[PDB]
Design a protein around this ligand. Structure first.
Ligand SMILES: N#Cc1n[nH]c2ccccc12
Lengths: 39, 156
């Protein structure tokens, strides 16, 4: 059995931690909704 | 139950203790999450019940109580924020410049941020606070790191 609990408001935070790169990847999406890399 | 707009944790008591299987967005009376989080099962909100209304395994999305309401899109240029809601941890905004998944059917924004699987369904927002998609369906790249698509539905 599944249940939901509130975790917060959806707002943009000024001064949030900035991280993560921006890779450009060739990908394929199958009928089951799984992404895979194409090479 | 609770119908206030916001981000919510998706929990189950079927396994050991209370386990967080994912996250979702409540907007305009509709709960939005990823299909792999609930598998289309009913949800409880206090004494209330949330029934699935629309879903698609290929998009990996599902809406409850009504049709998908989120229609904002990443502009292809600006930084965005993942409003990450990790299991047992407070909601935290993380800012990043999305990369891109190039597919045979077009390009999709992608966020290279690594969180536990139970963080799936956490919203990705633009600078106006609009939800441009959900985090949690993506790929494992060469060095073992995770890259999620910015998954967005269609507002009918
Ligand atoms: N494999 C894998 C994952 N690592 N981190 C995730 C976050 C959301 C969904 C899946 C994963």
């Amino acid at each position: 059995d599944m249940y939901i609990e509130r975790a917060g408001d959806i707002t943009w935070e000024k001064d949030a931690e900035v991280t993560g790169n921006s890779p450009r990847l060739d990908v394929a999406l199958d009928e089951s909704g799984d992404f895979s890399l194409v090479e | 139950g609770e119908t206030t707009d916001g981000v919510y944790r998706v929990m189950t008591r079927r396994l050991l203790g209370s386990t967080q299987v994912g996250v979702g967005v409540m907007q305009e009376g509709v709960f939005h999450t990823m299909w792999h989080v609930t598998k289309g099962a009913a949800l409880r909100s206090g004494e209330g019940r949330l029934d699935p209304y629309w879903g698609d395994v290929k998009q990996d999305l599902v809406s409850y109580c009504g049709p998908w309401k989120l229609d904002a899109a990443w502009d292809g240029l600006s930084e965005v924020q993942l409003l990450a809601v990790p299991p047992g941890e407070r909601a935290k905004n993380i800012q990043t410049l999305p990369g891109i998944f190039k597919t045979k059917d077009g390009d999709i924004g992608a966020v290279a941020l690594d969180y536990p699987a139970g963080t799936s369904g956490s919203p990705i927002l633009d600078k106006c606070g609009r939800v441009i998609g959900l985090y949690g369906n993506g790929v494992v790249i060469k060095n073992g790191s995770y890259v999620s698509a910015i998954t967005q539905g269609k507002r009918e």
